[PDB]
Design a protein around this ligand. Structure first.
Ligand SMILES: NS(=O)(=O)c1cc2c(cc1Cl)N[C@H]([C@H]1C[C@H]3C=C[C@@H]1C3)NS2(=O)=O
Ligand SMILES: CCCCCCCCCCCCCCCC(=O)O
Ligand SMILES: CCCCCCCCCCCCCCCC(=O)O
Ligand SMILES: N[C@@H](CCC(=O)O)C(=O)O
Ligand SMILES: N[C@@H](CCC(=O)O)C(=O)O
Lengths: 54, 94, 42, 98, 49, 49, 49
């Protein structure tokens, strides 16, 4: 679920990057969210597989 | 019929509420479902009756008195002993 | 081990087979005519 | 069963007035006979009144006692709580219920 | 006929022509680790980079 | 002793010394695993040599 | 000695008119007796001179 939230948050930063064009840290914030979302997806897959081994 | 059986597990257990039923309904296990099947075919009304002395059965060499289920049948205190009763020679002659 | 209906050789045969089981006879018979005959054991 | 003869610290017994006890008494085997004499003269009482007492005693024993019983009763205890008993070794004789 | 007590124990069983031992697969070098680990190693490799 | 070749095997020291026979690259002895059927197809046809 | 009973392709025997041969003949053991009968009826002559 956290991965879904981070991807949604990253999308808003991309969407907001066409209004506040002067600001540049918005594009960086999106990059962190999409990378962080990927790392959260790794944990979810590992936990799901590990639990099914119980 | 007076069925003779002994309190073991999972042969004759009890339910989570064993204070309120009445009769054979209160017994559950492997030798109570088998007894139902054995009596549904032959067509008899069995009555479960837990062995009083509470032993599987043996013969005291001293007095030759057969105790337990095996000794609960030779005298005439029951007919059908549906329980775990291994087959041995000491019991095959009685 | 069967026997014809009424045959007086029912009660001695039954008990007999039960004698062999409590003496370690049957178990040894099985171990010898089965396991020992193993011609294909890295 | 042979491994029991290899030691004496660990005790063992059989249920009273039950087929298993009668088997050792009349067993004319070299190993089974030995066991019948070890337990009959061993203090305190190893021949438990009921199976429930014997199994519980082995649990509290922590490994110094081995309970000898039929396989069928040895399969609704290893798969039931607290799941602290295990069957070691095959069967000694082939018998059935009736 | 009047049968007696079972002197031995049996039971129906399927017999088949013993299938010769197989040759380890062409990609047997992936066997030491489960398919899940190989999948996660790829994800870790991408994530780390 | 036989000096087997890529296509046909022949005879060495023995009763026969020149007799050659085309090797049976698909011998029937069982089952033909789909990965084993494609190895013997590439072998038999010697496409790579 | 037991491992001999596990097979029949490999043969064995004992010297003639020698203590060893007499031991199997009069051995009242389950395994040694079996051996005495295997060799006495086995062709060709395993009892070497
Ligand atoms: N293990 S076995 O199949 O060789 C084997 C199997 C069996 C044997 C004896 C042997 Cl040796 N005897 C028992 C018999 C003894 C008494 C208990 C059950 C019957 C009456 N039947 S069995 O349980 O079918
Ligand atoms: C619970 C784990 C959360 C992981 C995801 C959190 C990502 C946070 C991203 C913040 C980016 C900030 C970049 C701009 C910083 C600045 O203003 O200097
Ligand atoms: C890009 C060109 C690549 C050429 C080399 C690829 C060779 C692939 C394998 C060819 C032979 C395969 C034989 C069957 C193997 C098997 O399934 O056991
Ligand atoms: N039920 C068996 C005995 C069971 C046991 O000794 O554990 C009998 O016929 O006596
Ligand atoms: N030395 C043996 C003969 C050799 C053997 O028995 O193998 C004997 O006293 O007869």
């Amino acid at each position: 679920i956290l991965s879904v939230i981070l991807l949604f948050m990253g999308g808003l930063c991309i969407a907001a990057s066409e209004f506040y064009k002067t600001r540049h840290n918005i594009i960086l914030s999106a990059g962190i969210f999409f990378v962080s979302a990927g790392l959260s997806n790794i944990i979810g897959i590992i936990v799901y597989i590990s639990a099914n081994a119980g | 019929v007076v069925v003779t059986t002994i309190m073991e597990s999972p042969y004759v257990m009890y339910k989570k509420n064993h204070e309120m039923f009445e009769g054979n309904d209160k017994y559950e296990g492997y030798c109570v479902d088998l007894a139902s099947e054995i009596a549904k075919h032959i067509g008899i009304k069995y009555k479960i009756a837990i062995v009083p002395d509470g032993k599987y059965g043996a013969r005291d060499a001293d007095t030759k008195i057969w105790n337990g289920m095996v000794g609960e049948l030779v005298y005439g205190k029951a007919e059908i002993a549906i329980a775990p009763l291994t087959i041995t020679l000491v019991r095959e002659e009685v | 081990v069967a026997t014809p209906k009424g045959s007086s050789l029912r009660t001695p045969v039954n008990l007999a087979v039960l004698k062999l089981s409590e003496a370690g006879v049957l178990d040894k018979l099985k171990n010898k005519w089965w396991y020992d005959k193993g011609e294909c054991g890295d | 069963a042979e491994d029991l003869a290899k030691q004496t610290e660990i005790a063992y017994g059989t249920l009273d007035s039950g087929s298993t006890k009668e088997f050792f008494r009349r067993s004319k085997i070299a190993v089974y006979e030995k066991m019948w004499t070890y337990m009959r003269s061993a203090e305190p009482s190893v021949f438990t009144r009921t199976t429930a007492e014997g199994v519980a005693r082995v649990r509290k024993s922590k490994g110094k006692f081995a309970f000898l019983l039929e396989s069928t009763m040895n399969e609704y205890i290893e798969q039931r709580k607290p799941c602290d008993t295990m069957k070691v070794g095959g069967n000694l004789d082939s018998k059935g219920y009736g | 006929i009047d049968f007696s007590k079972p002197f031995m124990s049996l039971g129906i069983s399927i017999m088949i022509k013993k299938p010769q031992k197989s040759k380890p697969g062409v990609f047997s070098f992936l066997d030491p680790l489960a398919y899940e680990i190989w999948m996660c190693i790829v994800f870790a490799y991408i994530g780390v980079s | 002793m036989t000096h087997s070749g890529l296509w046909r095997t022949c005879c060495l020291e023995g009763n026969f010394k020149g007799l050659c026979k085309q090797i049976d690259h698909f011998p029937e002895d069982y089952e033909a695993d789909t990965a084993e059927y494609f190895l013997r197809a590439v072998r038999a046809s010697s496409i790579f040599p």
